[PDB]
Design an enzyme around this catalytic site. Structure first.
Site, PDB file in Angstrom:
ATOM      1  N   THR A   1       0.904  -1.304  -0.161  1.00 17.41           N
ATOM      2  CA  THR A   1       0.028   0.037   0.056  1.00 17.41           C
ATOM      3  C   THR A   1       0.810   1.245  -0.208  1.00 17.41           C
ATOM      4  O   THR A   1       0.488   2.040  -0.757  1.00 17.41           O
ATOM      5  CB  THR A   1      -1.026  -0.150   1.099  1.00 17.41           C
ATOM      6  OG1 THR A   1      -1.943  -1.056   1.098  1.00 17.41           O
ATOM      7  CG2 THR A   1      -1.839   1.182   1.252  1.00 17.41           C
TER       8      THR A   1
ATOM      9  N   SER B   1      -6.002   1.187   0.058  1.00 19.55           N
ATOM     10  CA  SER B   1      -6.615  -0.176   0.764  1.00 19.55           C
ATOM     11  C   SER B   1      -8.178   0.227   1.094  1.00 19.55           C
ATOM     12  O   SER B   1      -8.370   0.879   1.937  1.00 19.55           O
ATOM     13  CB  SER B   1      -5.821  -0.138   2.227  1.00 19.55           C
ATOM     14  OG  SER B   1      -6.352  -1.306   2.802  1.00 19.55           O
TER      15      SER B   1
ATOM     16  N   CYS C   1      -5.437   2.095  11.112  1.00 25.90           N
ATOM     17  CA  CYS C   1      -4.078   1.687  10.597  1.00 25.90           C
ATOM     18  C   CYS C   1      -3.050   1.818  11.858  1.00 25.90           C
ATOM     19  O   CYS C   1      -3.015   3.206  12.208  1.00 25.90           O
ATOM     20  CB  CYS C   1      -3.865   2.106   9.325  1.00 25.90           C
ATOM     21  SG  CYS C   1      -2.323   1.574   9.137  1.00 25.90           S
TER      22      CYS C   1
HETATM   23  C1  HEM Z   1      -0.171   4.802   3.094  1.00 29.56           C
HETATM   24  C2  HEM Z   1      -0.302   3.682   3.627  1.00 29.56           C
HETATM   25  C3  HEM Z   1      -1.298   2.980   4.422  1.00 29.56           C
HETATM   26  C4  HEM Z   1      -2.483   2.948   4.290  1.00 29.56           C
HETATM   27  C5  HEM Z   1      -3.407   3.739   3.105  1.00 29.56           C
HETATM   28  C6  HEM Z   1      -3.014   2.076   5.174  1.00 29.56           C
HETATM   29  C7  HEM Z   1      -4.404   1.637   5.349  1.00 29.56           C
HETATM   30  C8  HEM Z   1      -4.864   0.890   6.110  1.00 29.56           C
HETATM   31  C9  HEM Z   1      -6.289   0.406   6.222  1.00 29.56           C
HETATM   32  C10 HEM Z   1      -7.465   1.087   5.598  1.00 29.56           C
HETATM   33  C11 HEM Z   1      -6.607  -0.281   7.547  1.00 29.56           C
HETATM   34  C12 HEM Z   1      -7.802  -0.850   8.174  1.00 29.56           C
HETATM   35  C13 HEM Z   1      -7.995  -0.228   9.358  1.00 29.56           C
HETATM   36  C14 HEM Z   1      -9.417  -0.598   9.604  1.00 29.56           C
HETATM   37  O1  HEM Z   1      -9.363  -1.852  10.194  1.00 29.56           O
HETATM   38  O2  HEM Z   1     -10.288   0.244  10.038  1.00 29.56           O
HETATM   39  C15 HEM Z   1      -5.075  -0.579   8.032  1.00 29.56           C
HETATM   40  C16 HEM Z   1      -4.823  -1.282   9.141  1.00 29.56           C
HETATM   41  C17 HEM Z   1      -3.628  -1.892   9.440  1.00 29.56           C
HETATM   42  N1  HEM Z   1      -2.269  -1.318   8.771  1.00 29.56           N
HETATM   43 FE1  HEM Z   1      -1.991  -0.037   7.200  1.00 29.56          FE
HETATM   44  N2  HEM Z   1      -2.310   1.431   5.929  1.00 29.56           N
HETATM   45  C18 HEM Z   1      -0.862   1.925   5.544  1.00 29.56           C
HETATM   46  C19 HEM Z   1       0.323   1.622   5.967  1.00 29.56           C
HETATM   47  C20 HEM Z   1       0.695   0.660   6.856  1.00 29.56           C
HETATM   48  C21 HEM Z   1       1.940   0.593   7.379  1.00 29.56           C
HETATM   49  C22 HEM Z   1       3.226   1.312   6.589  1.00 29.56           C
HETATM   50  C23 HEM Z   1       1.771  -0.496   8.197  1.00 29.56           C
HETATM   51  C24 HEM Z   1       2.827  -1.295   8.822  1.00 29.56           C
HETATM   52  C25 HEM Z   1       4.178  -0.667   9.237  1.00 29.56           C
HETATM   53  C26 HEM Z   1       0.607  -0.922   8.317  1.00 29.56           C
HETATM   54  C27 HEM Z   1      -0.070  -1.898   9.080  1.00 29.56           C
HETATM   55  C28 HEM Z   1      -1.385  -2.096   9.388  1.00 29.56           C
HETATM   56  C29 HEM Z   1      -1.747  -2.905  10.465  1.00 29.56           C
HETATM   57  C30 HEM Z   1      -0.936  -3.875  11.368  1.00 29.56           C
HETATM   58  C31 HEM Z   1      -3.295  -2.813  10.376  1.00 29.56           C
HETATM   59  C32 HEM Z   1      -4.320  -3.576  11.295  1.00 29.56           C
HETATM   60  C33 HEM Z   1      -4.722  -2.678  12.397  1.00 29.56           C
HETATM   61  C34 HEM Z   1      -5.649  -3.170  13.296  1.00 29.56           C
HETATM   62  O3  HEM Z   1      -6.626  -4.366  12.866  1.00 29.56           O
HETATM   63  O4  HEM Z   1      -5.751  -3.230  14.437  1.00 29.56           O
HETATM   64  N3  HEM Z   1      -0.312  -0.045   7.551  1.00 29.56           N
HETATM   65  N4  HEM Z   1      -4.233   0.265   7.330  1.00 29.56           N
END
Ligand code: HEM
EC number: 1.7.1.14
Length: 400
Positions: free
Chosen positions: A240, A283, A349
């Site tokens: 992403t 995402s 996130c």
């Molecule tokens: C611009 C970059 C990114 C976008 C647009 C993005 C977007 C998202 C979205 C839409 C979710 C779902 C949140 C939800 O369930 O409401 C999410 C969850 C998550 N993201 Fe990302 N993300 C990005 C970068 C990252 C990075 C760099 C990491 C790790 C270093 C990461 C790790 C995670 C994790 C572990 C979750 C699950 C959190 C949970 O369920 O407690 N993300 N992200």
């Protein structure tokens, strides 16, 4: 009958056309998944926030009716879950084990390192040059920036970053055979297992070490859990991030007045990033639930054990929240409601602050280093991800 979902994007850089029609005429509706099962699709910003926060809805993927979108998803739902797929209280019990590195204060303290990583990769790109033709901004820059940062935070030594960045890219590259992708996936897991063993013996200042000292050795989790949590942190966000950097460059090429603004004033990078994360929701398929019990959403009854997909991509184009939602305008006046690029609620996130710092650093620096950076192919010929996937860019030829 109900239409098949996921929908296909209307064109390379555009969301599925269906969402705007559904927002206007049927904001909570049924869709047909790959296996013939049904799920509810939520399209309005207000309803997406409701789905993201309702404690009557569950992320546990062994529950009946969970909306898996592919055969691969059904297979993955059999594995022991990590916190991305957990409900309270298990969710924060495990998420709190790694959240400290991602707080606003921690990410602020990381800014010199983020800047250095971006600067070093841009200098490498300059040294390589483009004297014999365009070069791929994805391979040379959009891929290694987020890769090097998350690997370094997890604990990977500097010398191993280039190889592991390549292997993780093979894992998700559309050209990889199944054998190639699976071998790369296992290579990453094998490497992380050895690193967990190393940091159990001699911890250092990294996420894996903190997990080993604070959770594995006291018996709060085991070492295979530490591997899977590290793996989740790598794979959840990396592709992403890569897509958001590349989409940012293409979006600026498509909006030359705003690119000229940014070239003239790098302090506009935070506003650019805010609008980019709203406009290109890379995402869009992660806010999924099943109903633990009957729940009413708008004019629909979602019955117990029925699946729900809440489109944050659609929410981010919701005309009732964002005026002129289908115009990219980094000079826009923002409303009270959060854009939902990073989700909402408890599962929002974990890396939102880190991701925005990476993107802000990129877009406040890239055009200072390369004021003449140009997309080298006609914008209509950019190689976007296939239309039935999350928006993204596979490769992006540039000169500078
Ligand atoms: C611009 C970059 C990114 C976008 C647009 C993005 C977007 C998202 C979205 C839409 C979710 C779902 C949140 C939800 O369930 O409401 C999410 C969850 C998550 N993201 Fe990302 N993300 C990005 C970068 C990252 C990075 C760099 C990491 C790790 C270093 C990461 C790790 C995670 C994790 C572990 C979750 C699950 C959190 C949970 O369920 O407690 N993300 N992200």
């Amino acid at each position: 009958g109900a239409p098949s979902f996921p929908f296909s994007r209307a064109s390379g850089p555009e969301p599925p056309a269906e969402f705007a029609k559904l927002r206007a005429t049927n904001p909570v509706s049924q869709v047909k998944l790959f296996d013939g099962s049904l799920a509810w699709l939520v399209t309005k910003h207000k309803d997406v926030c409701f789905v993201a926060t309702s404690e009557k809805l569950s992320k546990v993927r062994t529950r009946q009716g969970f909306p898996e979108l592919s055969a691969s998803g059904k297979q993955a739902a059999k594995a022991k879950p990590t916190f991305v797929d957990m409900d309270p209280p298990e969710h924060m019990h495990q998420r709190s084990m790694v959240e400290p590195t991602f707080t606003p204060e921690a990410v602020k303290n990381l800014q010199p390192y983020i800047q250095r990583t971006v600067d070093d990769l841009l200098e490498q790109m300059k040294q390589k040059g483009c004297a014999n033709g365009p070069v791929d901004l994805v391979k040379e820059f959009a891929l290694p920036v987020p890769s090097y940062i998350i690997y370094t935070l997890l604990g990977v030594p500097f010398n191993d970053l280039e190889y592991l960045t390549q292997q993780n890219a093979i894992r998700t590259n559309g050209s990889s055979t199944a054998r190639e992708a699976s071998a790369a996936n296992q290579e990453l897991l094998d490497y992380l297992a050895i690193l967990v063993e190393q940091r159990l013996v001699e911890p250092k200042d990294d996420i894996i070490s903190k997990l080993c000292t604070e959770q594995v050795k006291p018996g709060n989790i085991d070492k295979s859990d530490a591997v899977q949590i590290a793996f989740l942190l790598l794979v959840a966000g990396n592709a992403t991030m890569v897509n958001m950097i590349a989409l940012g460059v293409a979006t600026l090429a498509q909006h030359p007045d705003q690119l000229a603004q940014l070239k003239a004033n790098p302090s506009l990078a935070p506003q650019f990033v805010e609008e980019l994360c709203r406009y290109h929701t890379a995402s869009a398929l992660a806010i999924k639930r099943t109903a633990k019990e009957d729940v009413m959403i708008g004019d629909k009854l979602v019955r117990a054990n029925e699946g729900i997909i809440a489109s944050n991509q659609s929410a981010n184009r919701d005309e009732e929240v964002f005026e002129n939602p289908d115009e990219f305008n980094m000079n826009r006046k923002w409303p009270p409601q959060d854009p939902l690029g990073f989700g909402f609620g408890d599962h929002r996130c974990i890396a939102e602050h880190l991701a925005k710092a990476e993107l802000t650093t990129v877009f406040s620096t890239l055009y200072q280093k390369f004021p003449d950076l140009k997309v080298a192919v006609p914008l209509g010929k950019i190689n976007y991800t296939p239309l039935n996937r999350d928006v993204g860019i596979v490769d992006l030829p540039v000169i500078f």
